[PDB]
Write a protein that binds this ligand. Structure first.
Ligand SMILES: *[C@@H]1O[C@H](CO)[C@@H](O)[C@H](O)[C@H]1NC(C)=O
Lengths: 48, 48
């Protein structure tokens, strides 16, 4: 009943859809408590 | 230092002046603005 806490993933190309590996990114962010230092692109168009 | 923005204004002029601050009029143009957010209350100047 001693157990090592980690285990490795058997990622093989023969795994079924599900047991195959998936890469993940979580874009986490905390909002509106400091001066803005990231924004989406403020799109622009031709001068007439 | 306003709402997290540290703002610098400045000017240069040539003089021929012995030991005083010269009587005259000047308008300081803004040179940089820094979104640093830090509180300031104290300061020093660094000399050669
Ligand atoms: C700046 O100072 C004010 C008052 O002393 C305080 O309420 C605020 O939390 C301070 N901010 C930081 C980042 O230290």
């Amino acid at each position: 009943n001693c157990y090592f806490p980690l285990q490795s993933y058997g990622f093989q190309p023969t795994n079924g859809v599900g047991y195959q590996p998936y890469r993940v990114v979580v874009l986490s962010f905390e909002l509106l408590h400091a001066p803005a230092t990231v924004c989406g692109p403020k799109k622009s168009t031709n001068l007439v | 230092n306003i709402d997290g923005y540290f703002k610098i204004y400045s000017k240069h002029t040539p003089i021929n002046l012995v030991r005083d601050l010269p009587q005259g009029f000047s308008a300081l143009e803004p040179l940089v603005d820094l979104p640093i957010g830090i509180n300031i209350t104290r300061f020093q100047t660094l000399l050669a």
